């Protein structure tokens, strides 16, 4: 029996990655789209089956929804999310899970306390080509690790770029370098006429000194790589956060006079981000991992936020 899952929220991602993957994948069934108009809603349901609602509560009342997707601006995640989970629901929310941590923590509290998953959607994370990349680095190909980068930019309640954008290089950073990474100093330019993030940068730490720096941005050309720089090599490789489906990744390496590149299989990081929420409702195992991991994402944004020069201009 699938599980059945209501949206809240008819988010441009929503119709461009979640829902495809929610209506393609034999174990989870789309049962209602709610908008806070009911035209919109319709839209999303003509395309992609399920009841329209209007409205979010009503969502949350019904008996055919066991778990719910929320792609909202992130500002309004928490609201939805505490009010999801108070009426029953597992609930896969769009990175970034909250906007601070004691939030976050809370939260999980809400849903510890009732046995219901929240987990926090990165799409990335389920791509296997992380894995592979990190795979050559722990077979020596470039040596020790001495730093890493990553960089997210993309052309012009909105979140600004730090919570919609920032969050991803930051989760990189951890997802490669572990548990232990320290904010060190970062820059938010600020753009005054509307009052929000359009950029930043931001350097981190591990405790043994391996250095993360990390740009993110909504000013900029589009970017969205990662870079590791090794005592006798480096490696770095582009579509990094949102590789198409169909895309075949190329890792690149560089040492001393010779350079390789490796082309990996093709994989579709969002039917399998939804696999892994639905596999885990479905069976109960609720990876701890996940949520330490969310937790921990959710002190390093607050500490980049709280540390950062804040720079407005013009
Ligand atoms: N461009 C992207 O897709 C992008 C990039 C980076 C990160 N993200 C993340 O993905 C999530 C969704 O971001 P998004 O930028 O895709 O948002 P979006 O297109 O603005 O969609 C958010 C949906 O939320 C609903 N909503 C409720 N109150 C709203 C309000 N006051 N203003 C605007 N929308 C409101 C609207 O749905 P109804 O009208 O149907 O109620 C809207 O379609 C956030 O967690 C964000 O960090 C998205
Ligand atoms: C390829 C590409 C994109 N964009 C723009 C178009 C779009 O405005 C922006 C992001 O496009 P994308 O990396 O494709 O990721 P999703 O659409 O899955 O978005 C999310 C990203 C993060 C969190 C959730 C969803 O970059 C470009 O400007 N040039 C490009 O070559
Ligand atoms: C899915 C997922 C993972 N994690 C956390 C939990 C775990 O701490 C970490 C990675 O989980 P995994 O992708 O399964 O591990 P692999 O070895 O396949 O991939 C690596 C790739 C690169 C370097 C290490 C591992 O992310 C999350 O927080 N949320 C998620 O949805
Ligand atoms: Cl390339
Ligand atoms: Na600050």
């Known amino acids: 029996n699938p599980i059945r899952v209501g949206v809240i929220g008819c988010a ?99 849903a510890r306390e009732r046995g219901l998953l929240l987990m926090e959607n990165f799409m990335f994370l389920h791509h296997p080509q992380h894995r592979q990349v990190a795979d050559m680095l722990d077979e020596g190909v470039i040596g020790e690790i001495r730093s890493f980068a990553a960089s997210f930019t993309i052309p012009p309640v909105g979140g600004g770029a730090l919570l919609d954008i920032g969050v991803y290089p930051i989760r990189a950073a951890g997802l490669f370098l572990g548990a232990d990474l320290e904010f060190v100093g970062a820059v938010l330019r600020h753009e005054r006429d509307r009052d929000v993030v359009v950029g930043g940068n931001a350097l981190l730490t591990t405790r043994q000194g391996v250095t993360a720096q990390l740009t993110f941005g909504m000013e900029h050309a589009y970017t969205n790589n990662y870079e590791f720089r090794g005592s006798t090599g480096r490696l770095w490789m582009n579509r990094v956060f949102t590789p198409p489906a169909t895309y075949q990744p190329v890792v690149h390496i560089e040492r001393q006079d010779h350079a390789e590149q490796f082309v990996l299989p093709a994989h579709d990081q969002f039917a399998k981000s939804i696999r892994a929420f639905a596999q885990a409702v479905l069976s109960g195992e609720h990876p701890r991992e996940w949520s330490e991991d969310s937790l921990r994402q959710a002190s390093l944004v607050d500490a980049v936020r709280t540390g950062a020069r804040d720079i407005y201009f013009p």
């Open 12 to 110: 441009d991602i929503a119709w461009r990655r979640a829902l495809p993957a929610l209506e393609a994948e034999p174990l989870t069934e789309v049962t209602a789209i709610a908008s806070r108009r009911w035209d919109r809603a319709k839209r999303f349901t003509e395309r992609f089956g399920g009841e329209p609602v209007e409205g979010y509560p009503a969502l949350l009342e019904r008996d055919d929804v066991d778990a719910v997707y929320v792609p909202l601006p992130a500002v309004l995640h928490a609201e939805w999310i505490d009010r999801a989970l108070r009426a029953g629901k597992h609930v896969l929310a769009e990175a970034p899970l909250t906007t601070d941590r004691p939030q976050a923590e809370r939260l999980f509290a809400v």
